[PDB]
Design an enzyme around this catalytic site. Structure first.
Site, short mmCIF file in Angstrom:
data_model
loop_
_atom_site.label_atom_id
_atom_site.label_comp_id
_atom_site.label_asym_id
_atom_site.label_seq_id
_atom_site.Cartn_x
_atom_site.Cartn_y
_atom_site.Cartn_z
N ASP A 256 0.69 -1.16 -0.05
CA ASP A 256 0.01 -0.34 0.01
C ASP A 256 0.74 1.37 0.00
O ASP A 256 0.17 2.27 0.42
CB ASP A 256 -0.94 0.12 1.24
CG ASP A 256 -2.45 0.71 1.04
OD1 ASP A 256 -2.57 1.21 -0.08
OD2 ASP A 256 -2.81 1.02 2.18
N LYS B 60 2.16 4.98 -0.64
CA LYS B 60 1.57 6.21 -1.43
C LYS B 60 1.37 7.22 -0.47
O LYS B 60 1.94 6.85 0.49
CB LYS B 60 0.08 6.01 -1.94
CG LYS B 60 -1.09 5.54 -0.87
CD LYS B 60 -2.21 4.94 -1.41
CE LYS B 60 -3.10 4.30 -0.32
NZ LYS B 60 -4.02 3.59 -0.93
N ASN C 289 0.13 6.89 3.09
CA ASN C 289 0.58 5.84 4.13
C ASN C 289 1.98 6.25 4.94
O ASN C 289 2.33 5.45 5.72
CB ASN C 289 1.11 4.50 3.25
CG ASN C 289 -0.40 4.06 3.25
OD1 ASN C 289 -1.11 4.39 2.33
ND2 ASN C 289 -0.65 2.83 3.51
N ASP D 18 -0.77 2.18 8.58
CA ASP D 18 -1.65 1.20 7.83
C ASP D 18 -0.92 0.04 7.06
O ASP D 18 -0.37 0.21 6.15
CB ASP D 18 -2.22 2.10 6.39
CG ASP D 18 -3.17 3.50 6.92
OD1 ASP D 18 -4.21 3.26 7.82
OD2 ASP D 18 -2.95 4.30 6.22
N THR E 285 -4.33 0.65 -4.85
CA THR E 285 -4.87 1.99 -5.72
C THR E 285 -4.19 1.84 -6.90
O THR E 285 -2.85 1.71 -7.20
CB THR E 285 -4.45 3.29 -4.79
OG1 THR E 285 -5.15 3.00 -3.80
CG2 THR E 285 -4.88 4.45 -5.72
#
Ligand SMILES: Cc1cc(C(=O)O)ccc1CN1CCC[C@H](O[C@H](CO)c2cc(Cl)cc(Cl)c2)[C@@H]1c1ccccc1
Ligand SMILES: [Cl-]
Length: 467
Positions: free
Chosen positions: A280, A282, A285, A298, A317
């Site tokens: 994840d 990005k 995060n 996260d 994403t």
């Protein structure tokens, strides 16, 4: 004396805590240990007394009590038998006793004072002293858990909201009993988790963040639950959100991105050393602490992968998904190295290199690859060089997944002059320095109103059992 040593040694190998220690430590221990004898009813220790000695039971049982006030009855706590030990606080300084240890029958201890123990710790440098601190560190994390295990939600009060989404919200909470202690409580609607099929993403998130012990990752100390929500007690990183800083600034200066990329690079060195894939990555995060250092928060898409194994779950994403995830081939740790090149490109320009009007069209420009992208003039030759090496199509050829692993990324021309030890030591001065007045200061976060809406349904299905 010489045969006494042979039993003391075989007895230490029976205790689970010590048995795993090196024999240098165990033989050295068997020389110094003095055997003391007690009779049924005798107080080995008394509450309120000051002492400097640690005890290990070699024969018998003891009952531990604790009177909380002069005019109150005693409070029985536990019964310790052979192999169990007590008085340990006496060795690491603090000599005041908090409970009475009474002999429940004929008792025999092996005792060692504070000086005798400190003098004994002088031994084989990175062979035995290294191995001693590893167990002490491991043992420090079980002590931490039990401090938090005694806590309830009722022991905290809410300060202000840190984030609000569909999930629920993040709240800054203060420990009532010690007001210097503040945490970032992530309250989650169980209904949402259920409706999105995230019961196992959230079970793994818990397992990984609690297991993790890195300064580039946010600590998850424990979890709580009620009929409607899950509560995740985490360390309060009051520097502000990285995505709100990027929003306000547009793009980041070359050297600023280098610092945040470096923080991620260490998080990935740690995670990949334990066989965990993050996925994840990005700017949403990453969170800065009061010092201005970034941490990974996260662990929803994070996964524990077997050495020599891949995963197949299509997730993430669209803008940050790697080619092997889209193509549904296998994906492993090297998928995270694709993410570093995307993060880099976005932090320097304000947007990722691949995006279309829907997931599908975003996936079509991603499979075209980084070689088709006309890199903006704002990206520096060295930075572009690294992004092109990090975002290669074949995961086997990708920088970070080569001979030296993560070291190949740390050795890139872009990190020439970067103090990697300064960062790990925590002595490197960050690019943006947050103003944090006190543990309750939420001035680097946006202001969200209180939720007016009714609470979600109860859910007592039992998947929450572990929380
Ligand atoms: C629970 C705990 C908390 C902390 C802390 O919070 O500081 C540190 C260590 C520990 C673990 N800790 C508890 C007391 C018995 C034991 O520590 C004592 C004192 O450190 C000790 C006594 C003897 Cl005779 C021998 C050893 Cl190796 C260690 C244990 C430990 C086991 C192996 C290695 C190191 C330490
Ligand atoms: Cl830690």
């Amino acid at each position: 004396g010489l045969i006494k040593h042979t039993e003391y040694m075989e007895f230490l190998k029976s205790v689970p805590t010590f048995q795993s220690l090196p024999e240098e430590i165990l033989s050295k221990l068997a020389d110094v240990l003095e055997e003391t004898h007690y009779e049924n009813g005798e107080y080995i220790i008394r509450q309120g007394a000051r002492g400097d000695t640690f005890f290990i039971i070699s024969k018998g049982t003891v009952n531990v009590t604790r009177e909380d006030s002069p005019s109150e009855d005693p409070v029985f706590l536990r019964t310790l038998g052979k192999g169990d030990w007590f008085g340990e606080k006496a060795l690491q300084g603090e000599d005041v006793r908090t409970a009475n240890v009474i002999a429940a029958e004929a008792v025999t201890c092996l005792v060692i004072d504070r000086d005798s123990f400190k003098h004994l710790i002088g031994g084989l440098d990175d062979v035995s002293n290294k191995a001693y601190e590893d167990a002490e560190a491991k043992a420090k994390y079980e002590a931490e858990a039990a401090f938090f295990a005694n806590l309830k939600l009722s022991d905290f009060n809410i300060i202000d909201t840190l984030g609000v989404g569909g999930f629920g919200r993040v709240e800054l909470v203060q420990l009532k009993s010690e007001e210097s202690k503040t945490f970032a409580m992530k309250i989650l609607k169980k209904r949402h988790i259920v409706d999105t099929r995230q019961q196992e993403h959230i079970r793994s998130e818990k397992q990984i963040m609690q297991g993790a012990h890195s300064d580039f990752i946010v600590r998850l100390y424990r979890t709580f639950k009620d009929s409607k929500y899950l509560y995740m007690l985490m360390e309060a990183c009051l520097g502000g959100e990285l995505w709100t800083i990027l929003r306000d600034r547009g793009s980041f200066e070359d050297s600023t991105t280098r610092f945040y990329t470096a923080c991620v690079v260490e998080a990935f060195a740690y995670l990949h050393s334990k066989g965990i894939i993050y996925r994840d990555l990005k700017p949403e995060n990453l969170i800065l602490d009061h010092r201005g250092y970034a941490k990974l928060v996260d662990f929803g898409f994070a996964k524990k992968i077997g050495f020599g194994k891949k995963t197949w779950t299509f997730c993430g994403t669209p803008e940050y998904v790697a080619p092997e995830i889209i193509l549904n081939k296998g994906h492993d740790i090297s998928a995270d190295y694709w993410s570093l090149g995307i993060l880099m490109y976005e932090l320097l320009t304000g947007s990722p290199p691949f995006s279309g009007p829907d997931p599908m069209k975003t996936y079509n420009i991603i499979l075209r690859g980084i070689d088709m992208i006309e890199f903006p003039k704002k990206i520096a030759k060295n930075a572009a060089n690294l992004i092109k090496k990090l975002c290669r199509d074949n995961p086997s050829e990708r920088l970070g997944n080569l001979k030296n692993g993560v070291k190949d990324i740390q050795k890139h021309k872009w990190f020439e002059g970067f103090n990697w030890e300064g960062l790990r030591k925590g002595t490197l001065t960050p690019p943006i320095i947050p103003s944090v007045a006190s543990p309750t200061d939420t001035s680097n976060f946006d202001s969200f109103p209180e939720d007016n809406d009714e609470p979600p349904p109860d859910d007592n299905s039992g998947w929450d059992i572990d929380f």
